Amino acid sequence: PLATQCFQLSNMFNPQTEEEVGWDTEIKDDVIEECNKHGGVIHIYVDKYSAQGNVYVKCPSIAAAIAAVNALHGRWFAGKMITAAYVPLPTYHNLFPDSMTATQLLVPSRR
Amino acid sequence: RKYWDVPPP
């Protein structure tokens, strides 16, 4: 697989078993915080519908995405193994057209 | 809150 600025994380949660309000916002913050160890994030989307527990991420550069994918892939998250896979830039932009011009690094909502 | 690196029960 060819490296890009964009990736997908899977197995991060199961939407059917997520009851607490604003759970998806907490996942987003978990991912932002962890990606700040690499090179940060400019776009993130927590898929609240797919059973696979998918999170889409765009980093500010290809180098930042590679560092994040290598460090996130195969980790445990809440007792389950997570997968990280690259998404081609046109596939990602078709899903999320507003990410095309995102440039600002994201900050978690919580403290 | 702790979810990163938490193995199964």
Cβ-Cβ contacts under 8 Å, A79 against chain B: 6-9
Structural domains present in chain A: 1-111 (3.30.70.330)
Cβ-Cβ contacts under 8 Å, A80 against chain B: 8
**Cross-strand partners of A55:** A9, A46
Cα-flanking dihedrals φ and ψ of residue A22, to 5°?
Answer: 70, 25
Q: Do A79 and B8 touch (CB under 8 A)?
A: yes
Structural biology method used: X-ray
Q: Do A78 and B6 touch (CB under 8 A)?
A: yes
Give CA–CA dist A13/A11, Å, rounded. 6
Give CA–CA dist A6/A60, Å, rounded. 9
How many angstroms is the resolution? 2.2
Is A48 in CB contact (< 8 Å) with chain B? no
Q: Is A13 exposed, middle or buried (0-12, 13-18, 19+ CB in 10 A)?
A: buried
Q: Do B4 and A77 touch (CB under 8 A)?
A: yes
DSSP class of residue A34?
A: H
